[PDB]
């Protein structure tokens, strides 16, 4: 219908936070491999001079940016790991919603604001938020440990 059909990269840029919540795979994919699929595929064109005359001016432009894309990507996958949820896309926590971050209610958050819009209104607190989830894991990580000893 709408959630089971085509959309496109970054299509829900101006769609509500709730709307975008279906089209994650679209922008959760191609973060990496958006280019490694295309590069490997298009680069094996019948040229036979891939990296001829060793490396060149486009030589570093790519590798300086190839090596970025992955660590940039592995940075967000390191957060999923360190927050104990690499299920991605959507994941709940014990960290509760400090209304000091946003006093607003549920109804309008998901059905009126968009993520671009939202992440701005919440940009300043994200640092403090993100650090709360890490300390949420470690409480849980010690509580796990304590029980590993006695059983």
């Amino acid at each position: 219908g709408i959630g089971a059909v085509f959309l496109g990269f970054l299509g829900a840029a101006g769609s509500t936070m709730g709307a975008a919540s279906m089209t994650l795979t679209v922008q959760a994919r191609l973060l990496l491999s958006g280019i490694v699929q295309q590069q490997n595929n298009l680069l094996r064109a019948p040229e036979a001079q891939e990296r001829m005359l060793q490396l060149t001016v486009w030589g570093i432009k790519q590798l300086q940016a190839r090596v970025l894309a992955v660590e940039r990507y592995l940075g967000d996958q390191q957060l999923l790991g360190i927050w104990g949820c690499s299920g991605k896309l959507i994941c709940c926590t014990a960290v509760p919603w400090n209304a000091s971050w946003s006093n607003k209610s549920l109804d309008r958050i998901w059905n009126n604001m968009t993520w671009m819009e939202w992440e701005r209104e919440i940009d300043n607190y994200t640092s403090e938020i993100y650090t709360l989830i890490e300390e949420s894991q470690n409480q849980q990580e010690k509580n796990e440990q304590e029980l590993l000893e006695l059983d």
Epitope: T16, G18, A19, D107, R108, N111, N112
Partner: nanobody, 131 residues
Framework: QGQLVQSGAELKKPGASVKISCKTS????????INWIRQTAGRGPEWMGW????????????????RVIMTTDTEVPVTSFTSTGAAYMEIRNLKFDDTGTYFC????????????????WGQGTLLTVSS
């Protein structure tokens, strides 16, 4: 966070035309509906109809479905998050009881149950109809 303005009191006669527009500020005109409500003293504040400035879909009141026709202009962005725009509602074959303080009203949400239901309200420019 925004504000709406309208067309001033346009005196007309029974059996004529009268046009009443609404212009926006401080919000994305396309993102929200535009409703229309008067203040007939005899009937009450009767709701006329709403229209989407994005999808062009309407839902007029069967009372004036054939009588009135709605229409909108393009949106003129101010910032990356705000804009300005125009919308209309003309009514022909007028009578006497088509009068009151006329309000335009922007919707509440972009999505949900109360999508079209108005939150922000216009000026209220009074209209009388006599020869």
């Amino acid at each position: 966070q925004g504000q709406l303005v309208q067309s001033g009191a346009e005196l007309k006669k029974p059996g004529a035309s009268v046009k009443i527009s609404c212009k926006t500020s401080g919000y994305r005109f396309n993102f929200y509906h535009i409703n229309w409500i008067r203040q007939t003293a005899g009937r009450g504040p009767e709701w006329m109809g709403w229209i989407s400035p994005y999808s062009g879909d309407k839902n007029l009141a069967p009372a004036f479905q054939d009588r009135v026709i709605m229409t909108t202009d393009t949106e003129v962005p101010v910032t990356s998050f705000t804009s300005t725009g125009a919308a209309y509602m003309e009514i022909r074959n007028l009578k006497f009881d088509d009068t009151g303080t006329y309000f335009c009203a922007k919707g509440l949400l972009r999505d949900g149950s109360s999508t079209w239901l108005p939150y922000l309200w216009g000026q209220g420019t009074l209209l009388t109809v006599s020869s």
